[PDB]
From a paper:
The DXO/Rai1 family of proteins consists of mammalian DXO and fungal Rai1 and Dxo1.
Modeling of FADP into the active site of free SpRai1 based on the mDXO complex indicated that FADP would clash with residues 65–71 (β4-αA loop) of SpRai1. The structure shows that the backbone amide bonds for residues Lys66 and Ser67 flip by 180° to avoid the steric clashes between their carbonyls and flavin, which leads to a small conformational change for the β4-αA loop. This conformational change also enables a hydrogen bond to be formed between the Ser67 backbone amide group and the C4 carbonyl oxygen of flavin. Residues 131–137, equivalent to helix αC of mDXO, are still disordered in the FADP complex. The bound conformation and position of FADP in SpRai1 are highly similar to those in mDXO, indicating that the two enzymes have a conserved mechanism of recognizing this cap and catalyzing the deFADding reaction. However, loop 65–71 of SpRai1, which contains residues that are not conserved in DXO, makes more intimate contacts to flavin.
Author numbering: 0 to 130, 138 to 161, 172 to 208, 231 to 352
The structure:
């Protein structure tokens, strides 16, 4: 029936919106066995793994595949409620769902759909999905496992991506106040001061020159993901086609837009342009939803092309 559309290319060329430094307000850990713990017992330390590590080791016999079902955002609301933290923001969602909105102009092939509801008591707009274990995905999980060390002093080989640590963050993008929950791979040193600049994101990739358009898009997606949670470092394990780790590359998240500056072609999406469009997208979602009573359900869909489409559910 009635559809509302947002076009990436209808966005006027504006100045980049102000974005505050993400502020951690809560954190939690998920045990191997899915017990949610209100502590940082699953937060690991980064330690550089040996070069020429074989990322195939343990696949599939030591691989406990991830659950492969979306998590309801009510988990985060309940964390904040349990800790007595009030939600006076515009959006509550998983970091990765803002990454999808922000990076949609970058990859028209990644099709996705989210569900949105305004909570009647707090007025916040909650967003979730209701809709990853092949060898290449394992290389990524295995790179994280071999590059991290659990807490030992104040506390096997199995690769268990379901065991996680999560930071819940307040971040303002232009006039939209967001509460975002995201997974944190490990920390660079002791957990303090706001800790997110101490956090580290781990990635594995084949190495291409920055002249390569696909390499630049990938780095922009790495940047966007970490930027939204205030992650200070991205550490990339470059691997060859055999899955052997060949080179380690430590990046500061804020350096990725600087590093890419000499390589952008005149048509390319840039960090600043992505932030402008995202800010207009979020204002459009908020305006559209707030034009409905709370507890009205919406879907937000991207199916290629250059628009988002918002539908009221029947
Ligand atoms: C059908 C479906 C299945 C899903 N299955 C999982 C799952 O098994 N485990 C999980 O943590 N989240 C899964 N999700 C996504 C969750 O609902 C939720 O959005 C996410 O866990 C929230 O954490 P974020 O940190 O915001 O997620 P993101 O920023 O999107 O990604 C951060 C990290 O979460 C992991 N991750 C994210 N998405 C998936 C996925 N689809 N499958 C496996 N790992 C993923 C992975 O370690 C990733 O690091 P890396 O990017 O280096 O690969 C699934 C979503 C859908 C629609």
């Amino acid at each position: 029936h009635m559809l509302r559309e947002f076009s990436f290319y209808d966005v006027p060329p504006a100045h980049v919106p102000p974005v505050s430094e993400p502020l951690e307000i809560a954190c939690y850990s998920l045990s191997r066995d899915r017990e949610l713990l209100l502590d940082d017992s699953k937060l690991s330390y980064y330690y550089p793994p040996p070069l020429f590590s074989d990322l195939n080791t343990g696949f599939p016999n030591r691989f406990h595949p991830p659950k492969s079902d979306p998590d309801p955002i009510s988990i985060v609301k309940d964390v904040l409620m349990t800790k007595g933290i009030q939600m006076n923001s515009s959006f509550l969602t998983w970091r990765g769902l803002i990454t999808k909105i922000m990076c949609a102009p970058l990859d028209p092939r990644n099709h996705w759909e989210t569900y949105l509801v305004m909570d009647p008591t707090s007025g916040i707009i909650m967003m979730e999905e209701r809709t990853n274990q092949d060898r290449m995905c394992y290389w990524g999980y295995k790179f994280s496992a071999i590059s991290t060390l659990p807490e030992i002093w104040d506390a096997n080989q199995d690769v268990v991506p379901d065991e996680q640590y999560c930071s819940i963050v307040k971040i303002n993008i232009g006039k939209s106040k967001l509460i975002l929950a995201g997974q944190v791979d490990c920390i660079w040193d002791k957990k303090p001061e706001n800790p997110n600049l101490h956090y580290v994101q781990l990635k594995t990739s084949k190495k291409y020159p920055l002249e390569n358009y696909g390499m630049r898009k990938k780095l922009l997606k790495y940047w966007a993901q970490s930027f939204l949670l205030g992650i200070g470092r991205i550490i990339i394990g470059f691997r060859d086609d055999n899955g052997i780790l060949i080179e380690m590359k430590e990046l500061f998240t804020h350096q990725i837009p600087k590093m890419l500056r000499p390589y952008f072609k005149p048509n390319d999406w840039t960090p600043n342009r992505l932030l402008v469009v995202l800010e207009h997208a979020l204002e459009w979602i908020k305006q559209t939803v707030k034009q409905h009573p709370p507890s009205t359900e919406f879907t937000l869909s991207y199916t290629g092309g250059s628009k988002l489409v918002l539908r009221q559910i029947i």
